Each structure stands twice: as structure tokens, then as C-alpha cells.
Write an enzyme that holds these catalytic residues in place. Structure first.
Site, mmCIF file in Angstrom:
data_model
loop_
_atom_site.group_PDB
_atom_site.id
_atom_site.type_symbol
_atom_site.label_atom_id
_atom_site.label_comp_id
_atom_site.label_asym_id
_atom_site.label_seq_id
_atom_site.Cartn_x
_atom_site.Cartn_y
_atom_site.Cartn_z
ATOM 1 N N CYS A 139 -0.582 3.626 5.982
ATOM 2 C CA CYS A 139 -0.048 2.285 6.727
ATOM 3 C C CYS A 139 0.161 0.995 5.530
ATOM 4 C CB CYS A 139 -1.171 1.691 7.666
ATOM 5 S SG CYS A 139 -2.475 1.143 6.762
ATOM 6 N N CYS A 186 0.858 -1.175 -0.071
ATOM 7 C CA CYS A 186 0.126 -0.146 -0.157
ATOM 8 C C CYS A 186 0.707 1.375 -0.093
ATOM 9 C CB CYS A 186 -0.727 0.002 1.365
ATOM 10 S SG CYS A 186 -1.411 -1.488 1.939
ATOM 11 N N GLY A 195 0.705 -3.362 4.974
ATOM 12 C CA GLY A 195 0.810 -4.666 5.301
ATOM 13 C C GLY A 195 2.161 -5.372 5.399
ATOM 14 N N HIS A 228 -9.532 1.998 -2.395
ATOM 15 C CA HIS A 228 -8.105 1.607 -2.340
ATOM 16 C C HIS A 228 -7.503 0.658 -3.170
ATOM 17 C CE1 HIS A 228 -4.682 1.315 0.181
ATOM 18 N NE2 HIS A 228 -4.910 0.047 0.884
#
Lengths: 389, 389, 389, 389
Positions: free
Chosen positions: C375, C86, C377, C345
Site C-alpha cells: 500500500c 512505500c 501513502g 518498515h
């Protein structure tokens, strides 16, 4: 009334072995032309071909019709496939017996073919899978070896019969060994040669002639049998060693009236004196042969004691012992040259494979009355009574 | 001697339509119960269930036995599936008649079932693919609609028949529209209601009862028909419009001896007077019904002229026209309520479907002699002659 | 020293929505052409294309290169993809900044793109699957949304942040609904039109122009959110309502040294004054923004309180609240036009997507200092500080 | 300014050979740990992990991070994967250098890893296949070796270079056999043992240590190369013998500023004096090295003649000879221990693999300046200049 003029079977192959990439209709073809050659009948005289086959996914339109055409039977005759699982190969002979008996036909080629090796994996994907993992299904397991009511494998149905009949591991293992030693003994003495019709595995870097049952195991020991782990029930009693296997093969019979065979100068392998099919609890499907056999016998007007030879399909050691235990026929006259555990179990072809053995053994030992019988997944039994002439 | 005590068929679903996610045995269950209730026979009196099914990949063990049990036929009865492609549904009926005629059975449920929508995609993947793409084959197209000997689709076989019989686009289009028009008029008039047993599509967000053939098109124009492009031959004459569709459905018959129906107080829908099956060239498979219809009449001792009603399946307009043209029956008594071009063509069930149509139409118009015939892929044909009581 | 002379993003698409069948490279080409167009820079002046992309399985060799070649970037130029999940879309801008900072390039197109919709299903089958079923894995689940250490989805790391900071269902739902309502308002007032370049979805039966964020919900209610069931933890607090979705878009920025923009007369969208990337425990991966924003701010010599606008990606209402809670910046300057719960997203594009939004709103309100942070993963963060010129 | 303090690589394995079932990240974790160990560096001092990787489909979320974590890198560091096809492994080192050069990091582990044997097959199935077969695509061939603009394999780009530069079969074959005999000699004298870190293939029925390049052929003959048929163009010149292969491996370098090496007392493997990456026409992508090497030497201030050792990847014999011909460097200082034809070609790992190779031969023979370069499908090249300290 209706006799089997001739018969033939390919050798039974091992899973992914000799027939690994051979489609059932190729073996089918070989067997259909063997039966015609064997009797002296021309392709052109066949009215219809009836082949049981349980797993034809991906083989293309009606593989029974592909076998016939490939074997030379002209475009004028007809062909069809059918499924009664493990009973399919035997069932098909009774259905062509019926085609002749109602006067719908004069000459039928009937039996079964099966390629467990070539069975594909599948998924239903027309609707798409929008998100997540999906299963690719082994079709040999789903469509051929899984009970559709309880969701478990045939092996568990075998375990249900074991527990119910109180058949210990050692007793099933004993049975297993015997069928191997007996299969081996008969192969060594050429007992499977009349029935077998060598199949040519068309190669690229070599053509190979297959003419021996490759799944029989030579020098089968009880020690090796007793060290195998249970395949279906983690703390069970059925194992790879005492159950039949996954195999490929084809087998057929050439059927005609008694009087027609006589007009032709053919010496029949026997007369079909009766057949029967009965259902049982799917949980203990292995008991199939008990009710079917007796019916068969009753329709022929014979007593268990009249039988000179018996072929009772060896699905699992558990179910075979239970069959024999209940019916009580003399064990020495049942599966004299070995059974499915040793020989193999090409589902759709199995019933006509065991017919061949019965038929060539009756001839070679001069037995007069015989019976073939198999247990069918989903809770069914199929039995046929043959009398030599 | 053998009669059709009762009969029933589900409505025919459109592809990926109403029965899009319904497994064929479900459709079958419903029809086995329907034929059972319609005649006042209890499931427990059923000896065997015979269903034609061409694409059962992935449905698990023998869908015929899963449909029989779902319907409530006890586990002591027997069940099997068979395949003679498009003629499977009618041939099952014949095969079931034979069971009673040879005295192997008393009561039989027979017909066919198909879920073309649920047919999976498949790949033989036992070896492992070491490098490269591989195909995921649609079993609907490969196992049901592709000629195994020439590698082309049925549509092409149609085209061969077109060319051969010199059937022009307009003549094929004309036929099609007439079929839609007749099937639509029949539909509004409640002509399909007796034969159809409503099927409940078990939902989550609600149940849906289907009781109407959804593939029939209302107000089909000749203009729309003439604007379509040829589907198989890029510069051909067969279109989506003048060919049958891809569909789902099921249909059966409760069979028993005429004496038995009489002991029960049942007023049969017909007496099976004769059936026949003959082969032809796979390339012009649509000519199949010619020889098979004539054989059947010969066996029945009837003249084409004796027929009061005919159902000759409409695989493709071109083959339907060639058949009618060659046989010479009066167009006005063939597919009186429409045919497969409008109603659809659920392969394994299509012969039992047409048998229902014929049988309910002979009773409502009081016709006495009728014939059902279908062409078969691979080059075959099947026909059955029915006499009212 | 390195400025963003221009930027552009497509509309963000719903899962299997407007861009259900458009490969990611088509969307990044249209964004490459739009950045060039928007800064008066021709495609022959591009040195290299850097595109974050987390799920490129099946699109072919290096989709960054296929985007660049489609946009007309010379074959002399280079291109590569990169993946920090991300944070990819933002990292990329940071990496293209570094190529000009060290003197190896003059003009970079950097950003990210992603088609979650086109992500395929897969299986490792080179070894062969002897027998049984096998999983076909969704790569978007496996490769973009599941933690590799703990085995559960991104949604459960959200649950872990919710428990740990004690965020209730209610606080998370209000955050959620405020995200939809600020994004609907900004959409309705036109604030997304400067940053979005219309995408044309090549039709067959019609070309469709997409210039609007389709996942944004119009009239989002507290009640319908409140009725949702928890999606990851059967008895948790993250639902589909308060989590971002699965989406498709591309987005980028065109870079050059400040000296070079002044030579061409371009008024830049901002100056990159610093960026930072920092790990955290994979289990609370939602926290990533905290140390990464902190570190960016310290490298820029700014105080949290000096910021005028902030875009902090909304992976999940839980982690977004946690991040705002700890940083303590004025919530009224964060996501002033809505965030990923409402906008969507598209994983590898998201950081470029939010940079775009940041840049265009900084310009319209005349904000001087901004920050963009996501943020990641696997337990990480990336932040970027921007100042206007 | 920035040096290579230590490096390491796993042995390269053969397609479906030693590392047939080992995910890429496992091989990268062993190389991350070997470069820490070889430089006296602890994992906790690692700021970021940079791994090239072209085919990570099905491995899960960012494998770079999964290898870092497995190596003990703290969760506070970061990791990301990148993709510039064949030049990935060496571009990574360049981007890691950049990380330190612009002061965002002090310690980076950078290189590549690739498991071409674990690459899966895939199909986009979200929208479903309404009817018709679909391909299961090999992700290694599609994403790795197929040109996306012309649709053919890398092999054909090889054919275009051979035709264009007029290289005969014979000169290509001689090139191939000199690669095999130089690597074999190198292997037998222990020249690959400093660079190789032994990999333990965690077994069940035993653990196997792999510390030998297994693709190298021993006693490779010209005759066996001359009888092969051309693999890509049925009448071409590129064969399996003269092309590199499909391979598995990982390789990396630990980087830091020169001043920091010096504070730790490390004696580094060299100083990175420059790199470059330049695009070429995709059709002749093998010529990538020409402009990328000329650019890197230019940026270092070096003439071709100043180099003491060259590694130029052997994608295919044809492009290797074209590169050597054009550049004009002394062939005896190129691939002095063999190249990819012998050693193999694990896509994303290759440029780190050949760097490894350069670095350990430059220290063993005391060569002062070297260059490493690779050809990149899609039309690109990367080169890097290294000097000893």
C-alpha cells in the site's frame, strides 16, 4: 559620599537597525572610554566595571570583561555582568556605589549594555530529539520579554495595568505622541548631544558614525497612533505605538567618592543620595516604580514635591500613566526630553540610559534634585535619587 | 557586623547525569528554602535573592527571581542574577553582604546556581541565512569555558600555567588522585551530609532523591590517571583526569547582621571578615587566587599563617598547585574533604559550593579562620575570609 | 523475458537501533555487492543502479550513485533514486525491468534503501525569521509519513480503513501477534539467512556484524498488545502494536534477460511476468494493494487462486486485514514467514525487502507463482507477479 | 511509436526572486495543466505523473503526487518523483516513454520541477549533540551542488574541465556573454512565449503573474564579466558570471503513442527517436554530454551532422565549450535562444526546460532533428533524440 563624576551613553539604535550586527560589549567599550575621557581619568585607575546585560547568549565569556579590556582598562581591574532585567542598568550604578561605600574600591565604571538585535535563537539539544518537531526559541523574547510565571509577554502585564487603572487607548496614545514630540523636540535642539558619545559602526564598504537616536519618530501624528492594532491583546489597548521598542545601546557612569572627585578637580554630575528596589505582583510589574520610588525618597529624606526632575522609564504608555497618576509628581518635570517609547528600550542598558538623560538635563537646566526609576519584569522596581553639587 | 546565619548546597550532579534535565532555578529553589529552614527564618522575611549564574540561556526571565518565588519568597522581595564566571557563587555572597552593610537590606539569600547540562545550542538567525551551512553554537563552551580574548578553552590557560610554573604531568596527576581520595573519604564519612540538602528530581515514572555528589570517583588510581590523553593541548599535560568536570548544582547562604542573628537565637556559621577581587592576565587566569587571596587577608588584617582552613577551588590541577606553591599555605588545610576535580564544577555555583564546604568543615573541626578562593576565566580571582563565632 | 538472477537484503534495523548512524548508501552498497556475488556477476558489468529512497535529505548528492560507487560499479555506469513512497523498493525492480525490456540496458541492480534513523530535522530559513519561535520539522514525519492532502499521519488513514471495513481492536491485535510469532519462528528456523547479507557497522571501539532482524519480538503476547493505547486517534484502534514501525534497511535484486542468465549458466530466482501500479483515495491509502494486485494478475493472465505464495506488506494490521478480506486469497500462503509489523518498515526499501522474502521462500518450498504487493501513502498501490523457472 | 503531443514550462525564476516562497509542486501543477490543455487532453485520461526533483525536503509526501492532484489528475492515476540530479527533468521523459513502450501506460505527464529557493537547512538531531557546535546544513548545497566523492562544489568540477581542455577566462566569458545576448534577443522577439505558461504567484496583497524568465540579463557586457572574481578556485577561471545560477521552475511534456496522437487529431511536437545516459569521472562530470550524446545518436542511426538543432545545457561555460569542442557540431545551431547561463538552472526541472526550448524552436524554424543533453554531477550525462512529424 559617592558621586557620579561623568557619564556617557551611545545613541540608542532601532531593532536590526544601526547596531544590527554590533555586539553589546563593543558599544560597552565605547561608553566606558567616553566616561574616562570625559572626567579626565585614566583607564588604569578603574577598579571594576559593572555592566547590566540581560541577553548575552553567544557573546562569549563575560562580556563585561570583554568591554573593559576593549576600552583599555587593564587586566588588573575586574569586571562583571548582572541581571535585574529592565532595572539592570540603574541597579549596576547602585552596586558600584556600594563597592566604593564599603571601601572595596575607589573608582567604578557602572551601567549597562544590550544588543537585542544580536540575541540568538536557541534549543536545548544535548539529549537529542528522537521523533517530532521542536521549537527554536527566540532568546530575546524568552529570556527578556516573557513573564516566567504566567507565560505571557510584558505587553499583557501592561494590559493588566491598563484595565486596572482604567487607562483608555486614547489616553495611552496621547501619552505616546507627547513622548515622541518631546523626544523629537529635544533631539532637534541638541539636548541629547552632551550625553551621546558617537559610536563608529566598523564597516567594510564604509565605516558609519552613529550619533543620533534613530528610533525617535519625527512628526508623530495622533491619527497614525489611533489606527494601529493592539499587539498583545487582540481586543486590547497596548500597541506598537504606545509601547517601547526592541533596541540596542550602552550607557555608563564613572563613580568615585566626593572627596576623590574633588582631589581630581572634577565637577560631578551629582551625588547619589539614595536608591531602592522593591517587588510587586509580576502580573502588574509596570507598577514597579511606585513602591521603589517612594522608598528611594524616604531613604533620601525627600518628599515627592522636592524633586526638580524625574526620569520614569516608558516601558508601556499604560504603566507610565499609572506611575505618574499614583505618585502625583508634576508631569512637566518627568521625561522632559521624551522617553523609551520614542527613544527606545535596550533592556539591560535602559536604566543607565535614563540616568544619563536625567544627569545631563539636571546640569543644563540647573535642577538640584532628580530621580530615575524603572519597572522590572517579574514584578520589581528600581529607583535612585541624585542631587547636584 | 555581617554573618552567615545558615547555608546549604545541592549535591553536585555529573554532566547529563542526575540533574540532566533540571533547570538551574529548580536547584536554586531547594537551596533557598534549605537556608531558610536551617535558620528558622521565614521566606516572607527575605529582602533579596542574589544568585550567580553563568549560563541561563533559554531558562526565561531572570532565573534568580524564578528560584526565589518557587522557594516562596514573596513577590514583594527582589531577585537578580550576576556573572563573574567561576567566582560568581562567592562574589554573590559578598555583594549580598554589602546590601546589609549599606543598610539597604536586612536579610539576603546569596550564592549561585548552574545547569551546565541544560545549556542550549544557539545561532544568530535574525538576518536569515541565504546560502551555506551555519554553526549552532554550544553556549556552555562559548559563554562559559572559552577565553574571549585568545579564543581557546580554559584548559589551554591551565596549560600556560603548567608550563610557566613547570608543573609536570605526574605532579598534576598526583594532586588529582589526592583530591579524589580526600573527597571519597569525606563522602563515606558523612562529611558532606550537613551541607547537602537532598534534591528531589521530579519524575514521571518515579521520583528520585539525590543527596550524594555523583561525580566523585571511588578508588581513583594513579595508573588510570596516567593513561589518559591530554584534553586541550595534543602533546600537553592537562587531562580529563586532572581537570575539573562540567556539572550542575546550586548553593547558597542566608546572610544577616550579627546583631540580628543574635536577636533570633541563630548560631552563625561565620562572620564575613573580608573579601577581595583582582584581575590578572587572561592567559594565566588560574593564577587569579594569588593576588585576590592576599588582598583579602590584607583587608582582614590576617597573615596567611593565621588561616586554619582553606578552600581554593580546583579548576585544574596545574593552577591549584601553582596557587598553593605560591601562597605557601600548609597543603594539609586546603580542600580537606576534596576539591572540584572530584566534586565537580558547576560554574556559577562553584564559589557558594566551596563556601559551604569550608563553613561546615570549620564548624565540625572547630577551626576559627578560613578562606575560600577561586580563579576566574578572563583573568580574575576572588577570595573571602571567614571567622567563626 | 526478464529474470531476477539473484537478490539480497540487509537485516532490517530498529529505529535508532543497530544502524542508528549508518547512511542508507552504506547499506545499499553492501546489498549491491551481495547481488553481484550471489549471481557470479562482476561490478564492471553493471549498466545502472536504481534505488528507491524516500528520505535522502542531508546524505549528499544522489545516494544511489554513492551506493554504486562504493560497491565498485564503474564510473561509466549510471545510477538514480526514485520515490513512490512505500512502493518505491518494488517499483524500482519494475523500472529496472523496463530498461532491459526496451533495449537500453543489459544488467540492472534495482531495489531500495532507507535510513529513517538518519533523517534530519529542517527549516526553510533563507528568508529569515524576523522574530518569534519557529519549527524545526522532522523530515521522516513530514516527508515520509504524513498525508499531504489531509494533514494527518499514515496511522489515521489506517483508522479510516478499520472503521470502513469494521475491523475490531481484537482482530487487528490477533493479526499482529500472529505476524510476530510466524517471524520469530522463521527467524529461529533460519529462513531469513539466504536473503540477508550481513552488514558490518564500522566501529571505533569495535566493528559489529548485523545479520539478524532486530525489530521482531520474541514471545509476543496477546495481553501486552491488548493493553496498548491507540496512537493516532486518542479513541481508535491502531496502536504501535498493530502498526509497523520506523526502520532502517536496504534491499535489492539483480536483473537481466532470461537469455542472458542462460548464457551465463545462472539459475534465476524467478521470472518477472507482470507488475501494476494503481491509485486510490488518499484517505484509505491502505487499500492500494487491492486494485494493483488485481491489475497485476490480469496482466499476467492469472487467477488469484493460481498464486502459491504472496507477500502483502503490513503497513498496518487494519489495511492488511482489509486487503486479505477483499482479495480473498488463502491467508495461510500470505506472509508465511511474518510481515512488517514484526520485521519493520524501512520505507524506500520495504518493497524490495518483501520481494526478497518472497523469492527465497518461493525457492525453499518450490512455489511456482508469487505476488508481492504494498500500500502507498498519498493513495496508491504496486504489485508484482513472479514465476519460478 | 512514442511522441511528445505537447509541452510547457514555467518561466524560470531567480534565487529567492519571483518564486522565492512557492513550493515546487505548485509550479508543476500549472505545467501539468498547461500540457493537458495544450494537447486537448483531459486530466482524467492521465495514467501517471513522472517528475524529476532533486530537493524536495520539507515539501511533504511525494510532491509529484501533490502536483498531480492539484492539477485535477484523478486519484486513480499514479505519480512518482525521481532523481538523476541535473538530468532528472529529461530522464523523466525517457522513463515516461518506457511506461508506454512496454504497454503499462497510454498517457504520461513527465518532466521536472524544482524550488532551490525553498530548500531548507537541516541537521540530524535524533541522537543529540552532547557538547560542541554542529552545522545546520544547506540542503541545496549539500544534496544539490556538492560532489559526494571529492567533497567540493560543481564549480570545481568546472575548473578541472577548464584546466584539462585549456579554456581561457576570456573564451569562457565570451561564451557567457553570447548566451546572455542570444537569450535576451529571444526574449524580446517572443521566442519564449509559446513554451512558457504564465504562473500566478498567489499573494495576499495581490496576485502576480510571472511569464518572463527573470534571470536573463539585459545588455550584459564583456567588461562586467571580466571584472568578476573566480567563485570556486580563489585563482581559477569560473565565476558567477560564466556559471549558471540557483533557480526555480518546472517543465514537462505530455506523452502518448504516435498512433494515439493520430486517433486524437493531435499534431505532436516530435517523435522521441532515442535517448541514452552514460557515466564519466565525477571530477569532470561536465563532460557527461559527450558520451550520452554519441550514444543517443548511435541508437537513433544519426551522425552528428544530421542534427538541425541542439540544446546542450550550460551548467558552466567551461564544460559547455568542452562539449561543443569535442562533439564538433556547428555552434550556430546550439542554444540558438540562449542557455542556462542566462536562463537559469532549476536542477530537477532543467532537462525538461531545455527540451521545451528545443521543441518550440524546432517547430518555429521547421528543424527536423534535434537533441537535448545535460551534464550530471556525480559524473553522468543524458541525451535524447527528437524528430519532427
Amino acid at each position: 559620599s559617592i558621586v557620579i563624576a561623568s557619564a556617557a551613553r551611545t545613541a540608542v539604535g532601532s531593532f536590526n537597525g544601526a547596531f544590527a550586527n554590533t555586539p553589546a560589549h563593543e558599544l560597552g567599550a565605547t561608553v566606558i572610554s567616553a566616561v574616562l575621557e570625559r572626567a579626565g581619568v585614566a583607564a588604569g585607575e578603574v577598579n571594576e566595571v559593572i555592566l547590566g546585560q540581560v541577553l548575552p547568549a553567544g557573546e562569549g565569556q563575560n562580556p563585561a570583561r570583554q568591554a573593559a579590556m576593549k576600552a583599555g582598562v587593564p587586566q588588573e581591574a575586574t569586571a562583571w555582568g548582572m541581571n535585574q532585567l529592565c532595572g539592570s542598568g540603574l541597579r549596576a550604578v547602585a552596586l558600584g556605589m556600594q563597592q566604593i561605600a564599603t571601601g572595596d574600591a575607589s573608582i567604578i565604571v557602572a551601567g549597562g549594555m544590550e544588543s537585542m538585535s544580536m540575541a540568538p535563537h536557541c534549543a536545548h539539544l544535548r539529549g537529542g530529539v528522537k521523533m517530532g518537531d521542536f521549537k527554536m526559541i527566540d532568546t530575546m523574547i524568552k529570556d527578556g520579554l516573557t513573564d516566567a510565571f504566567y507565560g505571557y509577554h510584558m505587553g499583557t502585564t501592561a494590559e493588566n495595568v491598563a484595565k486596572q487603572w482604567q487607562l483608555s487607548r486614547d489616553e495611552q496614545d496621547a501619552f505616546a505622541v507627547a513622548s515622541q514630540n518631546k523626544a523629537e523636540a529635544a533631539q532637534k535642539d541638541g539636548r541629547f548631544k552632551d550625553e551621546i558619545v558617537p559610536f563608529i559602526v566598523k564597516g567594510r564598504k564604509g565605516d558609519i558614525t552613529v550619533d543620533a537616536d534613530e528610533y525617535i519618530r519625527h512628526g508623530a501624528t495622533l491619527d497614525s497612533m489611533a489606527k494601529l492594532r493592539p499587539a498583545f491583546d487582540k481586543e486590547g489597548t497596548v500597541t506598537a505605538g504606545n509601547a517601547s521598542g526592541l533596541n540596542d545601546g550602552a550607557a555608563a557612569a564613572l563613580l568615585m567618592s566626593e572627596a576623590e572627585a574633588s582631589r581630581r578637580g572634577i565637577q560631578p554630575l551629582g551625588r547619589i543620595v539614595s536608591w531602592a528596589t522593591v517587588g510587586v505582583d509580576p502580573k502588574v510589574m509596570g507598577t514597579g516604580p511606585i513602591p521603589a520610588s517612594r522608598k528611594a525618597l524616604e531613604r533620601a529624606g525627600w518628599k515627592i514635591g522636592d524633586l526638580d526632575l524625574v526620569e520614569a522609564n516608558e516601558a508601556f504608555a499604560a504603566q507610565a500613566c499609572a506611575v505618574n497618576k499614583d505618585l502625583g509628581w508634576d508631569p512637566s518635570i518627568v521625561n522632559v526630553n521624551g522617553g523609551a517609547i520614542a527613544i527606545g528600550h535596550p533592556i539591560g542598558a535602559s536604566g543607565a540610559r535614563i540616568l544619563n538623560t536625567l544627569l545631563f538635563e539636571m546640569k543644563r537646566r540647573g535642577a538640584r534634585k532628580g530621580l530615575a526609576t524603572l519597572c522590572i519584569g517579574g514584578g520589581m522596581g528600581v529607583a535612585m535619587c541624585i542631587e547636584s553639587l
